[PDB]
Design a protein around this motif. Structure first.
Motif, mmCIF file in Angstrom:
data_model
loop_
_atom_site.group_PDB
_atom_site.id
_atom_site.type_symbol
_atom_site.label_atom_id
_atom_site.label_comp_id
_atom_site.label_asym_id
_atom_site.label_seq_id
_atom_site.Cartn_x
_atom_site.Cartn_y
_atom_site.Cartn_z
ATOM 1 N N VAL A 181 50.335 34.333 32.303
ATOM 2 C CA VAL A 181 50.166 32.968 31.238
ATOM 3 C C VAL A 181 49.863 31.923 31.969
ATOM 4 O O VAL A 181 50.656 31.826 33.299
ATOM 5 C CB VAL A 181 51.488 32.848 30.348
ATOM 6 C CG1 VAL A 181 52.804 32.787 31.442
ATOM 7 C CG2 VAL A 181 51.216 31.636 29.727
ATOM 8 N N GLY A 182 48.756 30.959 31.705
ATOM 9 C CA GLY A 182 48.637 29.749 32.313
ATOM 10 C C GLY A 182 47.996 29.938 33.798
ATOM 11 O O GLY A 182 47.755 28.893 34.285
ATOM 12 N N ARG B 250 44.873 30.061 36.341
ATOM 13 C CA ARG B 250 43.434 29.370 36.220
ATOM 14 C C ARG B 250 42.698 29.809 37.495
ATOM 15 O O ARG B 250 43.140 30.198 38.622
ATOM 16 C CB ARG B 250 43.941 28.067 36.678
ATOM 17 C CG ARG B 250 44.378 27.237 35.449
ATOM 18 C CD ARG B 250 45.958 26.611 35.258
ATOM 19 N NE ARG B 250 46.064 26.182 33.719
ATOM 20 C CZ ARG B 250 45.760 26.829 32.656
ATOM 21 N NH1 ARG B 250 45.083 28.218 32.599
ATOM 22 N NH2 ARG B 250 45.819 26.463 31.307
ATOM 23 N N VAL B 251 41.041 29.824 37.238
ATOM 24 C CA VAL B 251 40.541 30.284 38.474
ATOM 25 C C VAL B 251 39.421 29.401 38.628
ATOM 26 O O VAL B 251 38.777 29.131 37.511
ATOM 27 C CB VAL B 251 39.878 31.791 38.164
ATOM 28 C CG1 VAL B 251 39.162 32.223 39.282
ATOM 29 C CG2 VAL B 251 40.985 32.652 37.779
ATOM 30 N N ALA C 175 47.014 31.188 27.339
ATOM 31 C CA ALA C 175 46.639 29.880 28.011
ATOM 32 C C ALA C 175 46.208 29.989 29.411
ATOM 33 O O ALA C 175 46.291 29.143 30.071
ATOM 34 C CB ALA C 175 48.001 29.019 27.934
ATOM 35 N N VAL D 3 50.225 27.724 43.186
ATOM 36 C CA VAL D 3 49.367 26.815 43.095
ATOM 37 C C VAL D 3 49.243 26.103 44.613
ATOM 38 O O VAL D 3 50.102 25.455 45.216
ATOM 39 C CB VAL D 3 49.490 25.538 42.593
ATOM 40 C CG1 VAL D 3 48.389 24.407 42.587
ATOM 41 C CG2 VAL D 3 49.875 26.370 41.084
ATOM 42 N N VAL E 15 46.954 29.419 40.740
ATOM 43 C CA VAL E 15 45.673 28.839 40.622
ATOM 44 C C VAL E 15 45.053 29.405 41.571
ATOM 45 O O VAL E 15 45.181 29.123 43.141
ATOM 46 C CB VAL E 15 45.785 27.432 40.752
ATOM 47 C CG1 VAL E 15 44.425 26.615 41.047
ATOM 48 C CG2 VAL E 15 46.661 26.620 39.561
ATOM 49 N N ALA F 153 42.840 30.246 31.987
ATOM 50 C CA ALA F 153 41.332 29.607 31.960
ATOM 51 C C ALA F 153 40.785 30.166 33.364
ATOM 52 O O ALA F 153 41.085 30.003 34.250
ATOM 53 C CB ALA F 153 41.550 28.302 32.027
ATOM 54 N N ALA G 287 51.855 34.416 36.582
ATOM 55 C CA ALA G 287 51.817 33.314 35.678
ATOM 56 C C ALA G 287 51.640 31.826 36.506
ATOM 57 O O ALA G 287 52.214 31.610 37.569
ATOM 58 C CB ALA G 287 53.152 33.139 34.724
ATOM 59 N N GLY G 288 50.859 30.895 35.952
ATOM 60 C CA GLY G 288 50.630 29.669 36.688
ATOM 61 C C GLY G 288 49.639 29.662 37.999
ATOM 62 O O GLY G 288 49.309 28.699 38.586
#
Ligand SMILES: CC(C)(COP(=O)(O)OP(=O)(O)OC[C@H]1O[C@@H](n2cnc3c(N)ncnc32)[C@H](O)[C@@H]1OP(=O)(O)O)[C@@H](O)C(=O)NCCC(=O)NCCS
Ligand SMILES: CC(C)(COP(=O)(O)OP(=O)(O)OC[C@H]1O[C@@H](n2cnc3c(N)ncnc32)[C@H](O)[C@@H]1OP(=O)(O)O)[C@@H](O)C(=O)NCCC(=O)NCCS
Ligand SMILES: CC(C)(COP(=O)(O)OP(=O)(O)OC[C@H]1O[C@@H](n2cnc3c(N)ncnc32)[C@H](O)[C@@H]1OP(=O)(O)O)[C@@H](O)C(=O)NCCC(=O)NCCS
Ligand SMILES: C[C@H]1O[C@H](OP(=O)(O)OP(=O)(O)OC[C@H]2O[C@@H](n3cnc4c(=O)[nH]c(N)nc43)[C@H](O)[C@@H]2O)[C@@H](O)[C@@H](O)[C@@H]1N
Ligand SMILES: C[C@H]1O[C@H](OP(=O)(O)OP(=O)(O)OC[C@H]2O[C@@H](n3cnc4c(=O)[nH]c(N)nc43)[C@H](O)[C@@H]2O)[C@@H](O)[C@@H](O)[C@@H]1N
Ligand SMILES: C[C@H]1O[C@H](OP(=O)(O)OP(=O)(O)OC[C@H]2O[C@@H](n3cnc4c(=O)[nH]c(N)nc43)[C@H](O)[C@@H]2O)[C@@H](O)[C@@H](O)[C@@H]1N
Ligand SMILES: [Cl-]
Ligand SMILES: [Cl-]
Ligand SMILES: [Cl-]
Ligand code: NA
Lengths: 210, 210, 210
Positions: A168-169, A171-172, A151, A203, A189, A153, A186-187
């Motif tokens: 997991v999860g 984002r870039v 998950a 984040v 960003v 991305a 995990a998570g």
């Protein structure tokens, strides 16, 4: 040690192996045997025949296709080289549900799990893992033995260094480069480039020291 | 300027165009030509024939189907209107892997990328982009020219204003309304309504001023 | 109250029902009727025939297959037991796009929405919901009547207690156990075990008291 002919040898017998075995089977491939550093069994019906010392025996009996199902990125890359030195070809394990654009360049030994999308003109290095549900948008560059976790991305034009890991999860955002051996929790960003060999969490993702 | 007949004209020749060209091709459509504000080439084999001043020539030669592959929401909406004034019909580019419920209402000029799911009774305005892996749950309303970025997700009964943009991995909880021209940063998790024309970032998303 | 024979009875007539009806239809099933606590209509063409007091009448007329399309986890679990006491079998509603590994153990009454992946050796309790786009990696254990919200993701070896709820885009890292009746807010990233009956929010998820 009596095997059928023609199947794929898997290095590693853990949870990642289970998912890889099922991806290969979903494509109509047969998995011949597992070699595992615990040489004691079976994983989803595939016999564990020994540890890596069994590789020469497997090659001698005519098995020549191999996948390294080991999540650890540096270990996976080392075991990939060992397998090739022993005369195996590294196959790719790409679940039938994955969407891999026709202009994507794939290396060898790559895992691409169920639900993945990889878009135009992305390049995926040998022994990369693109895990369940992950998305790779256009023009990304994934270095050898990196791992995009489930998950996660990448938006467009992202580069991920060799052996980097996104949890997991993660984002870039577009255009970001992540160095080799870097871990995004995990998570996390990621909104600016990350150098080699750091851990970044949050984040937005921030580097964590000691 | 010698083209085949029957194909789709694309406005824009960037990374978004590449992904759109491949979605159209995956559906068996042909892409005729690109018009790009840099009129200098080809994008994934599709010739760039000129800038927007070439539109009348393309229509005259019998090409009548068009997609606006420009990520910028306000520019995309303007170029959509220009294309329609020039006698083109705006097609939709919906990757074959996308799951679009039978009760979803789609406008025209809409991009729906690989891995997308859009559930029951959602309405999707003209020129929206629903990018790779994004999820739209039941009863959502997406205004014209908004953009849900890759791996973003709307829970049920969410409304997204015209030209609003949700960055990679943004999430919105049920029942929330987001105003027009609003930007949710990558990863932002929106837990209350957002008015028009703001930027919101974080978990939970908070409006950022100057 | 004139129905066709052979179809599925749905308890609940809300937005979750709409998505479930469409998943059943995408598999070629027919939905016979809805029972809803507001007994006043139709949902996507399926007649609402009464409230739960209509269940005995439906069973008497030969309908014996049922799904509980109620998002509330404790209510869903109670209504599942009521339906079984009335002689219905609880079907599963698994969208055709969902990828459910051959070694996954599924209970009954389970919703698995479009775009879902569930990997090797996961066990999914009765009346669980695995919502749109969610990912469940290998070796997970999902207790009865839990709900993984849209675009949520569990990494490997995660256990989710009975009636626990993970909001849109929630993530759980490997090996974590979440207690029964626990709520993880939208976007929460769970990095350590959570006990029963708490609410946890944030990246990383933290328990919120009063
Ligand atoms: C970030 C990570 C690598 C840290 O491991 P670690 O350094 O042993 O960290 P710890 O568990 O000691 O936690 C250190 C602190 O950071 C916090 N933290 C841990 N993981 C976090 C994350 N992903 N995001 C934000 N904060 C996190 C913890 O709350 C802890 O906070 P404290 O100082 O308030 O106690 C790990 O938690 C992680 O995210 N792993 C991803 C694993 C994964 O996704 N695997 C999928 C494989 S297919
Ligand atoms: C939020 C965003 C729009 C901000 O751009 P910007 O206003 O130029 O912001 P900056 O890069 O100057 O960063 C401003 C601050 O906010 C932080 N920040 C930036 N993006 C953030 C995000 N998504 N979430 C939380 N914080 C963020 C930065 O760390 C910086 O912090 P500092 O004050 O500690 O330095 C951008 O980072 C973003 O998220 N874009 C999404 C793009 C995308 O997903 N494209 C996919 C297209 S298909
Ligand atoms: C966490 C949640 C359950 C809280 O509901 P609630 O307790 O009524 O919380 P409130 O709306 O009163 O907000 C309480 C505070 O927490 C913050 N908050 C709310 N949801 C948050 C979330 N998901 N993450 C982080 N913070 C959150 C709010 O900003 C508010 O902050 P404040 O103290 O600064 O005002 C809810 O916001 C949520 O995330 N629901 C998920 C729903 C969903 O995904 N449904 C999909 C169904 S298919
Ligand atoms: C992507 C996945 O990566 C990891 O899963 P994994 O399968 O790699 O991890 P485990 O379940 O511990 O299994 C690792 C297996 O790898 C074997 N192994 C470990 N080292 C070796 C080796 O040198 N040679 C061989 N042939 N096998 C080796 C171990 O004995 C063990 O059986 C975890 O981080 C998971 O969280 C994740 N799903
Ligand atoms: C969704 C995507 O949106 C954006 O991608 P993109 O393809 O829109 O952006 P770029 O790669 O810069 O390409 C924009 C292209 O759009 C062209 N362009 C820009 N303005 C015009 C125009 O007015 N008319 C025409 N015909 N073309 C125009 C540019 O010359 C350029 O070739 C980015 O934000 C990406 O991050 C994202 N993947
Ligand atoms: C997963 C989904 O869960 C929830 O959607 P939902 O369909 O369960 O919620 P609603 O749209 O309010 O619909 C609930 C329906 O459930 C009916 N209901 C409520 N209680 C009962 C009941 O005891 N028996 C019967 N037969 N029906 C009952 C209500 O009258 C109402 O029509 C929400 O939390 C959504 O955000 C989410 N998409
Ligand atoms: Cl096999
Ligand atoms: Cl073409
Ligand atoms: Cl029906
Ligand atoms: Na997905």
């Amino acid at each position: 040690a009596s095997l059928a002919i023609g199947g794929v040898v898997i290095i590693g017998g853990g949870g990642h192996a289970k998912v890889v075995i099922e991806s290969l089977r979903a494509c109509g491939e047969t998995v011949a045997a597992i070699v595992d550093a615990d040489p004691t069994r079976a994983v989803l019906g595939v016999p564990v025949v020994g540890d890596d010392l069994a590789l020469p025996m497997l090659r001698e009996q005519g098995l020549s296709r191999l996948f390294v199902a080991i999540g650890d990125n540096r270990l996976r890359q080392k075991l990939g080289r060992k397998a090739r030195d022993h005369g195996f070809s590294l196959v790719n394990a790409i679940h039938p549900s994955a969407v891999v654009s026709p202009s994507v360049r794939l290396g060898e030994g790559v895992a691409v799990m169920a639900g993945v999308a990889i878009n135009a003109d992305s390049w995926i290095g040998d022994l990369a893992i693109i895990n369940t549900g992950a998305v790779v948008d256009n023009d990304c560059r994934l270095g050898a033995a990196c791992h995009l976790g489930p998950a996660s991305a990448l938006a467009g034009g992202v580069s991920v260094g060799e052996r980097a890991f996104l949890g997991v999860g993660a984002r870039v955002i577009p255009g970001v480069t992540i160095g080799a051996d870097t871990i995004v929790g995990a998570g996390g960003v990621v909104v600016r480039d990350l150098p080699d060999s750091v851990l970044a969490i949050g984040v937005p993702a921030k580097i964590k020291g000691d």
